[PDB]
Amino acid sequence: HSHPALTPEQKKELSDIAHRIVAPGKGILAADESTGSIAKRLQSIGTENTEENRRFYRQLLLTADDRVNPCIGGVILFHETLYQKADDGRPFPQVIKSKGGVVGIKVDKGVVPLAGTNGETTTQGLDGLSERCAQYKKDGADFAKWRCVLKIGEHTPSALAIMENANVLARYASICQQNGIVPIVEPEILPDGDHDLKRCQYVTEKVLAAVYKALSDHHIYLEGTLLKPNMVTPGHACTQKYSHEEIAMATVTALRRTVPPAVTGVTFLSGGQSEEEASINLNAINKCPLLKPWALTFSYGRALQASALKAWGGKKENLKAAQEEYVKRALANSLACQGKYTP
Amino acid sequence: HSHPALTPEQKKELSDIAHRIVAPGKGILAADESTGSIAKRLQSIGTENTEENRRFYRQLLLTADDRVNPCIGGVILFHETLYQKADDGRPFPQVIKSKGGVVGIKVDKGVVPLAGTNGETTTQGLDGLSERCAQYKKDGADFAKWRCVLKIGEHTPSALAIMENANVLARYASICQQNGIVPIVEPEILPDGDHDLKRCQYVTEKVLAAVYKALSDHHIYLEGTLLKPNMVTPGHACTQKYSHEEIAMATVTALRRTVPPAVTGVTFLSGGQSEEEASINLNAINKCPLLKPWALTFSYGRALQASALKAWGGKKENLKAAQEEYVKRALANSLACQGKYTP
Amino acid sequence: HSHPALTPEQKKELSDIAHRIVAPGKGILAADESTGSIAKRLQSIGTENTEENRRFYRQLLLTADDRVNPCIGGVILFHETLYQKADDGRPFPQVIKSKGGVVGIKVDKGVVPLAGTNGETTTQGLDGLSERCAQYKKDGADFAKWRCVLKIGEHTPSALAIMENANVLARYASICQQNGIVPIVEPEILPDGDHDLKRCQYVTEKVLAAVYKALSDHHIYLEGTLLKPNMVTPGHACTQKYSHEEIAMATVTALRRTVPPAVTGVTFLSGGQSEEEASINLNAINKCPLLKPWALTFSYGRALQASALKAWGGKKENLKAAQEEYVKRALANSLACQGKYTP
Amino acid sequence: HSHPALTPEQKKELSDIAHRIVAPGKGILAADESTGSIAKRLQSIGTENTEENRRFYRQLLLTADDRVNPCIGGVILFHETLYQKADDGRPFPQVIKSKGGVVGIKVDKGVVPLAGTNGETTTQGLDGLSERCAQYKKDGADFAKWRCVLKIGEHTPSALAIMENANVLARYASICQQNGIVPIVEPEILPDGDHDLKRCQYVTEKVLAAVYKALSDHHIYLEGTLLKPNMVTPGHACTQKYSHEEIAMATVTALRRTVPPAVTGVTFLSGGQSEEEASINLNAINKCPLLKPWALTFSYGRALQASALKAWGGKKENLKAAQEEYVKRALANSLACQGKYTP
């Protein structure tokens, strides 16, 4: 019958955390990058990838002034970032809490290939995820991120890939909710190929419907979850051009057809679009005439940090400059989150 | 890939019809009853079941005065009622349109047992449903009704029953949308047994999640559909008592966890509760603090017609009395639909 | 829990019927053809399609001499053929039983389009199928036929098409088994297009796995069922040529990977191949080195009747000639069924 | 479309390994007990659980004389056992190969609870399973074991538990097949509770059908897989008694209704029955009149080692006695595998 996956107290705590993450005007700073993922980001500047370099970069992102506080509602950290400290000895999770944000952790262990598929992948990281999530909860991490990657090809995403990603996302969400951590469901769809806005919307609708069916099957408390979907955008190789209004219409329509309103909020990912483009698209999404029952916030890695890194240059002389770039980009993204971004 | 099940014109027409059915302050009069279904209602008075008696009763329901126009946004008719005429010779569908309502038709052919299940049933009626729906469209019917019946037992509803009912509802919706008729999805759950509010909410969430996953799988245009679910209520044999606020909380919570906002509106069925109880529950649902992205209207068979039938008594002398009874009940249900019903 | 869909007596009767249909050396004569389906067959000669012409053709097929008896274990009849009589006043079902065969009936009501799919179709015929199957059981029909049509395209068959066809086949099987009639599951895959043997095998494996999962979900007694799949063959437009040994290998491999051994037998359909080609393919399948746990028989409409119809010419003078043609073709197909066909 | 999960060489190697494991007269010795799992076994004697004690016990199991060679076709080792050596310095995998057996490894990382279920669990171990399976392949392990635990309760196994266990088994099988390792699919159903033989058969059929549907969905090469299901037996608390012939009938019937013949063989697990009971049940299963298309062998942990461990007593003086006990038990189980076990 009905065996409560979560007690009312656990549901209340998860709802409180999720609503704090996507509180009005607040979004998510996705600062979770592995050693190799941030290696490409640091190599574009010319600065070598070291433990101290990573720590200083994340301190620069996290030690922003008071103007970032009402704009960043949560920060996703990598495993090693959760246990680093700021210059004053203050731990990074405590630095995030002191700014009013919610500490997050990337709990997925990357993608692995799916046999019999056209290069399609499923995400791993469920092994010992209960113990890991409990430890992260004791270490200040109140929500988790699990990046499930799907792409659009002539025969992709397949039924197997969508089902696998939805099932693994639901299992991750169940484990996180059992451990008191809000799971951010990310059925990210790669904007790779010549597929247009219509096919991206169709694929996003199918993927999100399967994801939420899997979440229902796993007894996931949707009020204690957040969604991190790809913006419904044409592929990078698509010749046809779409305005930000059309992209917003497609994204909001795809969300309204699949996502139940119980979801606390939808925190979009940039997904390979520029900082200004991501902010404008988020603003258009929040300005969409269609009624949007969720908090449509941002969870941006590149769209909040590309200019910050470029201004930083890897040297301490531009600490304040990179901080200012990141801060004003967070201001713009918060304005887009409230629908009041006018570039 | 993405093969459009409906052209943008068909989607626009379905959305227009669905929004007209559940326009603010308007609900649905479920006047659909087979010969045997209305036989029990007519036998409760002592009036014999004839073609003329059925015609006069449905004329009484349909030819109400002007105050019932802004309260009834749609009327579900039986097959024979769609082809009957009022006393002035004006056909019943045209009677409905002349009052601003939307003509509906019961297209399901009843429930049939599912083998290997504990008395569970699936609904038939898909044979020639395309031709039937096209004919109904030419005859004025703009939306269709398909009653899928589920119950709650110690091992019920099973995976087979939920899956089969969701699949048949999705097929019915696909056929209706292809024929230009708005499908009202009714995954009705019987309030039979001693199950409490919590288990009814759990079963409703599971059934609705499966139903909307099936609708997604069948490429159903959810903006051109309406939902007719059971109010989340304890079973008739349940000893524990629940307030109307608790029932509204459970119902709205179950809807928000499974129903996507793209659904034009949710038209509740009475499901064996009294007229006053149904109206109070609808009012409490529309007064629920949780944000409700859909038009929460009524689709009441007995909750709109029981008092009218008793007042009528089967004789022509109480025509005006039964008209006034039905009209005031529809006014109350419309007030509940807007959340302004104060008995 | 486990609610028996069938009593042990029902299971015993279904197993007895199914084993009688596919008894060693015996196959199925698929004489089931609607008025329009047989219209093209009769128009290839120039003979007008009348009730008497259809009756005489089916009598010619059914009134064969004693040499057809050990080769035809079952005959599928159309609805009107089940209620026609031979020249001597003997009803056609009784004519079939007098020859040791098992009377079958086409219970599906044709295919209907699936919305949102690339020309994919699902089969209807479930409305009142319980009453129809009971009546057929009283009229001598001991097994039923349900043709589900799938094709192979660049994006076809889709998940929706495979799932819906499997579900409708499982519902048909449940109804037939409840009514004491052995359901012949036919997830026929069209050999249309340029797809090769490998892709036909892949699609057949996927379709059959989904079909048998649906049969399990519907509590279908597989020992009281038969399978009527397409031979795994390259498409009609495929340029690459495959030997009969390769086709047999692919077909037997696809059956062994999906079909559980509980299935009484697999009765292949010709599916657009010539009579000699179908017989040679069946012989090669029964000569396949891989162990085959089921009775691999034939269920041929065109491959058993093409030459008989051509020799008949629509006139009574060639009655004996067409009878001999059909009889020798049945002998060849029985030899292929036992693996002893040497043309 | 059809993307080959495995090349024909990979399929040939997997089929060769699987057929070597379940070659006629040969079964599987399951020595895949973790430190805590074998702790209870060693505490039944009073011998402390040490690295040396575990090594000597597994050497005693593995270094048996020549007469045990044609009875054990494969040995499943724990992770630490795969890297231990015999007394003569010969590694345990090489000891297994020298006896004609196939080295196996337990790759699952135990069961974890499923939220919202009645104490139901899912199995973890997919993280880095590709690299682990590749390393095991380089270390001599040619097949892998993944124990998925299911139980029978008043509402258990649920749809979520069956679906998730089948999906994780399919993912494990895909990874193992990609790494050249034959996956032994074990959807073990606990014989706990008062459920009878009929309900165990029903649950086993449902679980196996879901498992093989998941294997089909994940493009698993079933010829390169083996099945390790529970013998269909009544629960431990069941009052009704069933004969060995009845248990064999139920088990073979459940296997024939769900397991496709492409599976190389079915290696039963003891599942809490005595050694003699397991051998008699295996003999009755292989003596079942129903045609069995697979090699019905044994994969016994307790049924092959319980009396051998008891005779060992934890001291070196009973090395020969315990080896003789294990050898004669393996001879009995091989005789049961060929159906020639007469106690």
Short mmCIF file of N, CA, C and O in Angstrom, two decimals, chain D residues 38 40-47 56-57 60-61 274-275 301-329:
data_model
loop_
_atom_site.label_atom_id
_atom_site.label_comp_id
_atom_site.label_asym_id
_atom_site.label_seq_id
_atom_site.Cartn_x
_atom_site.Cartn_y
_atom_site.Cartn_z
N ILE D 38 30.51 -14.45 5.51
CA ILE D 38 31.15 -15.68 5.97
C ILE D 38 31.44 -15.64 7.46
O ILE D 38 31.80 -16.68 8.04
N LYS D 40 29.24 -15.23 9.87
CA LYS D 40 28.23 -16.06 10.52
C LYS D 40 28.51 -17.54 10.29
O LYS D 40 28.28 -18.37 11.18
N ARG D 41 28.99 -17.89 9.10
CA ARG D 41 29.34 -19.28 8.81
C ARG D 41 30.49 -19.76 9.68
O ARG D 41 30.48 -20.89 10.18
N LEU D 42 31.51 -18.92 9.85
CA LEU D 42 32.66 -19.31 10.66
C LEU D 42 32.34 -19.28 12.15
O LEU D 42 32.95 -20.02 12.93
N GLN D 43 31.38 -18.45 12.56
CA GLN D 43 30.99 -18.40 13.97
C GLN D 43 30.11 -19.58 14.37
O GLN D 43 29.99 -19.87 15.56
N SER D 44 29.50 -20.26 13.40
CA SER D 44 28.72 -21.46 13.72
C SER D 44 29.61 -22.56 14.26
O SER D 44 29.13 -23.45 14.98
N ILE D 45 30.90 -22.53 13.93
CA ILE D 45 31.85 -23.50 14.46
C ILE D 45 32.49 -22.99 15.74
O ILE D 45 32.67 -23.74 16.70
N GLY D 46 32.84 -21.70 15.78
CA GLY D 46 33.65 -21.13 16.83
C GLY D 46 35.01 -20.67 16.37
O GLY D 46 35.80 -20.19 17.19
N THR D 47 35.32 -20.81 15.08
CA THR D 47 36.59 -20.38 14.53
C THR D 47 36.53 -18.90 14.18
O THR D 47 35.58 -18.44 13.54
N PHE D 56 42.23 -20.27 3.77
CA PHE D 56 42.32 -21.72 3.88
C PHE D 56 40.98 -22.38 3.57
O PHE D 56 40.94 -23.44 2.95
N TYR D 57 39.87 -21.78 4.01
CA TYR D 57 38.56 -22.34 3.71
C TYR D 57 38.30 -22.34 2.21
O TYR D 57 37.82 -23.33 1.64
N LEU D 60 40.39 -24.96 0.58
CA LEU D 60 39.78 -26.26 0.80
C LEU D 60 38.64 -26.49 -0.18
O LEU D 60 38.49 -27.59 -0.73
N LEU D 61 37.81 -25.47 -0.40
CA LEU D 61 36.74 -25.59 -1.39
C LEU D 61 37.30 -25.75 -2.80
O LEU D 61 36.75 -26.51 -3.60
N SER D 274 18.15 -27.16 2.85
CA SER D 274 19.27 -28.02 3.20
C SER D 274 19.95 -28.55 1.93
O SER D 274 19.41 -28.46 0.83
N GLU D 275 21.16 -29.08 2.12
CA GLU D 275 21.93 -29.59 0.99
C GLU D 275 21.18 -30.71 0.29
O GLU D 275 21.05 -30.72 -0.95
N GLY D 301 25.74 -21.87 -2.78
CA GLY D 301 26.70 -21.49 -1.76
C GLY D 301 26.59 -22.35 -0.52
O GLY D 301 27.56 -23.02 -0.14
N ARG D 302 25.42 -22.36 0.11
CA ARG D 302 25.22 -23.14 1.32
C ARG D 302 25.01 -24.62 1.04
O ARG D 302 25.52 -25.46 1.78
N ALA D 303 24.29 -24.96 -0.04
CA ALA D 303 23.98 -26.35 -0.34
C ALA D 303 25.19 -27.15 -0.79
O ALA D 303 25.10 -28.39 -0.85
N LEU D 304 26.30 -26.50 -1.12
CA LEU D 304 27.52 -27.20 -1.49
C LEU D 304 28.58 -27.16 -0.40
O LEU D 304 29.53 -27.95 -0.45
N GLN D 305 28.44 -26.28 0.59
CA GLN D 305 29.51 -26.04 1.55
C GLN D 305 29.11 -26.17 3.01
O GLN D 305 30.00 -26.12 3.86
N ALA D 306 27.82 -26.31 3.33
CA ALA D 306 27.42 -26.31 4.73
C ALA D 306 28.00 -27.50 5.49
O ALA D 306 28.67 -27.33 6.52
N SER D 307 27.79 -28.71 4.98
CA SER D 307 28.32 -29.89 5.64
C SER D 307 29.84 -29.97 5.53
O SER D 307 30.50 -30.48 6.44
N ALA D 308 30.41 -29.46 4.43
CA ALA D 308 31.87 -29.42 4.32
C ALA D 308 32.47 -28.51 5.39
O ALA D 308 33.48 -28.87 6.01
N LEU D 309 31.87 -27.35 5.61
CA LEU D 309 32.34 -26.45 6.66
C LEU D 309 32.15 -27.07 8.04
O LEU D 309 33.02 -26.96 8.90
N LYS D 310 31.01 -27.74 8.26
CA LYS D 310 30.79 -28.41 9.54
C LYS D 310 31.84 -29.49 9.79
O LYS D 310 32.36 -29.61 10.91
N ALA D 311 32.16 -30.28 8.76
CA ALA D 311 33.17 -31.32 8.91
C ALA D 311 34.57 -30.73 9.08
O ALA D 311 35.42 -31.34 9.74
N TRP D 312 34.82 -29.56 8.49
CA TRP D 312 36.12 -28.92 8.64
C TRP D 312 36.40 -28.56 10.09
O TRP D 312 37.48 -28.84 10.62
N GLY D 313 35.43 -27.93 10.75
CA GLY D 313 35.59 -27.55 12.14
C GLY D 313 36.58 -26.45 12.40
O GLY D 313 36.87 -26.15 13.56
N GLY D 314 37.12 -25.82 11.35
CA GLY D 314 38.06 -24.74 11.50
C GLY D 314 39.49 -25.15 11.77
O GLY D 314 40.36 -24.27 11.91
N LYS D 315 39.78 -26.45 11.85
CA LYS D 315 41.12 -26.93 12.14
C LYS D 315 41.65 -27.74 10.96
O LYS D 315 40.89 -28.36 10.21
N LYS D 316 42.98 -27.74 10.82
CA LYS D 316 43.63 -28.35 9.66
C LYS D 316 43.50 -29.87 9.65
O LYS D 316 43.71 -30.48 8.60
N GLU D 317 43.18 -30.49 10.78
CA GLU D 317 43.13 -31.95 10.85
C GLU D 317 42.01 -32.54 10.00
O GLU D 317 42.10 -33.71 9.62
N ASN D 318 40.97 -31.77 9.69
CA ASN D 318 39.85 -32.25 8.90
C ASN D 318 39.85 -31.71 7.48
O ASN D 318 38.79 -31.62 6.85
N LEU D 319 41.03 -31.34 6.96
CA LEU D 319 41.12 -30.87 5.58
C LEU D 319 40.59 -31.92 4.61
O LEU D 319 39.72 -31.64 3.78
N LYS D 320 41.10 -33.15 4.72
CA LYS D 320 40.67 -34.22 3.82
C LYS D 320 39.19 -34.54 4.01
O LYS D 320 38.47 -34.77 3.03
N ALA D 321 38.72 -34.56 5.26
CA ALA D 321 37.32 -34.89 5.52
C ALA D 321 36.39 -33.86 4.90
O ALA D 321 35.39 -34.21 4.25
N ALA D 322 36.69 -32.57 5.09
CA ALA D 322 35.85 -31.52 4.54
C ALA D 322 35.92 -31.50 3.01
O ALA D 322 34.91 -31.26 2.34
N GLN D 323 37.11 -31.74 2.45
CA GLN D 323 37.22 -31.81 1.00
C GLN D 323 36.40 -32.96 0.44
O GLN D 323 35.73 -32.82 -0.58
N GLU D 324 36.43 -34.12 1.12
CA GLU D 324 35.62 -35.25 0.69
C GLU D 324 34.13 -34.94 0.78
O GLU D 324 33.35 -35.30 -0.10
N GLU D 325 33.72 -34.26 1.85
CA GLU D 325 32.31 -33.90 2.00
C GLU D 325 31.86 -32.97 0.88
O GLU D 325 30.82 -33.20 0.25
N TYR D 326 32.65 -31.92 0.61
CA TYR D 326 32.33 -31.01 -0.49
C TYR D 326 32.33 -31.74 -1.83
O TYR D 326 31.48 -31.47 -2.68
N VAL D 327 33.28 -32.65 -2.03
CA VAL D 327 33.38 -33.35 -3.30
C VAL D 327 32.16 -34.23 -3.53
O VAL D 327 31.58 -34.23 -4.62
N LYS D 328 31.75 -34.99 -2.51
CA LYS D 328 30.60 -35.87 -2.70
C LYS D 328 29.31 -35.06 -2.81
O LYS D 328 28.39 -35.45 -3.55
N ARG D 329 29.22 -33.91 -2.14
CA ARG D 329 28.06 -33.05 -2.34
C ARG D 329 28.03 -32.48 -3.75
O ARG D 329 26.96 -32.36 -4.35
#
